[PDB]
Amino acid sequence: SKLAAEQSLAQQPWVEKYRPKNLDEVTAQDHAVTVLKKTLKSANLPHMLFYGPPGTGKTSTILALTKELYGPDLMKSRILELNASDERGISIVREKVKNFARLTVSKPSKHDLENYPCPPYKIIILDEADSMTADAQSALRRTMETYSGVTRFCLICNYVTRII
């Protein structure tokens, strides 16, 4: 269980072995993680758009934030990670993303509420949003604007100009 994961991390490349697991391991991107830590005590996480050069820690930051928010148990049930290795046309955005956003948040267990804040919303992260077509991006507008009470959107990209 835990020891197997420790050994696998110890037998992984240094890029993935030393991936920041908490919002404290990030060294230089302090302005964003300060707000991310202060909103961890509150419950008003807004829709976020991470942009910058490659290798600055956007994916690591959002993963550490989702972990510190939901715990290793709700981490697998209250997240929706859509990367560039999947289909992200208009059809996918309209069916899958909208169905997940319209879903209700999963009930936390007894051990979850004791150690983690467990916010009343889930997170739909979209990694590498540069490859998303403009129509599939415009389809996300009302999807993220009306279901903000139950889901939160996190876009990640390198060129902020590629997003409408």
């Binding site: 169905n99 319209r102 879903l103 209700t104 999963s106 009930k107 009470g149 139950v150």
Partner: protein
């Protein structure tokens, strides 16, 4: 918590078949009196309202009023994986979460535990059918289905006219024009074939055929369709279940 154990399995299957391809997103409400659910069509033209009391269930236990929203496609997919000989059990936890549909066989230990993830629909539960109706009538299900799917071939609109002791269904289209005139009469050896009609004012109003063709699908539940019509009032098409009722509120056309 919520425990709703049915007596059979095909009952809920036919209940969902009544409006399978009619609406999409429903929000059931389970209280101490029973399950009640109203759902608006995608085009916001008709409203399905179903109420099943504690009579159709074999066991019923509801602590607090719970609201479970779900899509009818996923509900149909879950219900199709259940055998017609199994026993159905709806379970809900303290807070509203994925409803547990349990299929329990009566002879072999077959525990089919499906978990349907809920939706988050705006629970805009209104209070409807609390208004006085100008004309009320009741007629067998088969006759209504026949008339509807016979007039739907001549046109796309159906005008219903209630005059003094006179019911009239008119279909005016392009290839032809049909008109059926049924008269109120009550039989004694067959009390179920009677066509009752209590009218206070003449009613003249048109509906669409694409919606009547889906309303008549509910004729598999009951055999006496009640129809309530009035000027500027939703047409009430009521099927009477053995425990509750399933009523479709259809919006009349604009002349």
């Amino acid at each position: 918590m919520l425990e709703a154990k049915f007596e059979e399995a095909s009952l809920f299957k036919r209940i969902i078949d009544g409006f399978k391809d009619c609406v999409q997103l429903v929000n059931f409400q389970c209280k101490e009196d029973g399950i009640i659910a109203q759902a608006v069509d995608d085009s916001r033209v008709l409203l399905v309202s179903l109420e099943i009391g504690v009579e159709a269930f074999q066991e019923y236990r509801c602590d607090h009023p719970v609201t479970l929203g779900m899509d009818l496609t996923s509900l149909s997919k879950i219900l199709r994986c259940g055998n017609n000989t199994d026993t159905l059990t709806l379970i809900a936890d303290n807070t509203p979460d994925s409803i547990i549909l349990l299929f329990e066989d009566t002879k072999k230990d077959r525990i089919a535990e499906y978990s349907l993830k809920l939706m988050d629909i705006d629970a805009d539960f209104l209070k409807i059918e609390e208004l006085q109706y100008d004309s009320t009538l009741s007629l067998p299900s088969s006759e209504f289905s026949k008339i509807v799917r016979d007039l739907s071939q001549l046109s796309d609109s159906i005008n219903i006219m209630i005059t003094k002791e006179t019911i009239k269904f008119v279909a005016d289209g392009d290839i032809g024009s049909g008109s059926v005139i049924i008269k109120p009469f009550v039989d004694m050896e067959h009390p179920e074939t009677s066509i009752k009609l209590e009218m206070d004012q003449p009613v003249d109003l048109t509906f669409g055929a694409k919606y009547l063709l889906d309303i008549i699908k509910g004729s598999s539940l009951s055999d006496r369709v009640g129809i309530r019509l009035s000027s500027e009032a939703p047409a009430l098409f009521q099927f009477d279940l053995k425990s509750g009722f399933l009523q479709f509120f259809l919006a009349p056309k604009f002349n």
